[PDB]
Amino acid sequence: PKPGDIFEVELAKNDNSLGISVTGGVNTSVRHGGIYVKAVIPQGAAESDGRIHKGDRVLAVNGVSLEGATHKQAVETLRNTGQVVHLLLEKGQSPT
């Protein structure tokens, strides 16, 4: 009954892309360099399926470690997937 737990989003990168507006990432606002989505945008396959979530701590994309990078860095990973969307993230906490 506590956060810190890790989870993965297995969306289908093929046939449909994502639809989330991501932010943070940069090694400043976040802990070190992990990404944190802003919200789930009601347009892409992400919001639809609802795999990703607000301020989601994405640490991997198809096996690509995100630890040590900015927002745009992950943005590239999440986006630059290809076949399937196998993103292993972490239960993101709230601001306060």
Curated annotation (Swiss-Prot):
It is found in: Cytoplasm, Cytoskeleton; Nucleus; Cell projection, Lamellipodium. Expressed in keratinocytes (at protein level). Present in most tissues with the exception of the liver and skeletal muscle. Most abundant in lung, kidney and fetal brain. Residues 8-92 form the PDZ domain. It comes from the Eukaryota. Tyrosine phosphatase which negatively regulates FAS-induced apoptosis and NGFR-mediated pro-apoptotic signaling. May regulate phosphoinositide 3-kinase (PI3K) signaling through dephosphorylation of PIK3R2. Interacts (via the first PDZ domain) with PLEKHA1 and PLEKHA2. Interacts (via the second PDZ domain) with TNFRSF6 (Fas receptor) (via C-terminus). Interacts (via the second PDZ domain) with TRIP6 (via the third LIM domain and C-terminus). Interacts (via the third PDZ domain) with NGFR (via C-terminal SVP motif) and PKN2 (via C-terminus). Interacts (via the second or fourth PDZ domains) with PDLIM4 (via C-terminus only or via combined C-terminus and LIM domain, but not LIM domain only). Found in a complex with PDLIM4 and TRIP6. Belongs to the protein-tyrosine phosphatase family. Non-receptor class subfamily. This is Tyrosine-protein phosphatase non-receptor type 13. The gene is PTPN13.
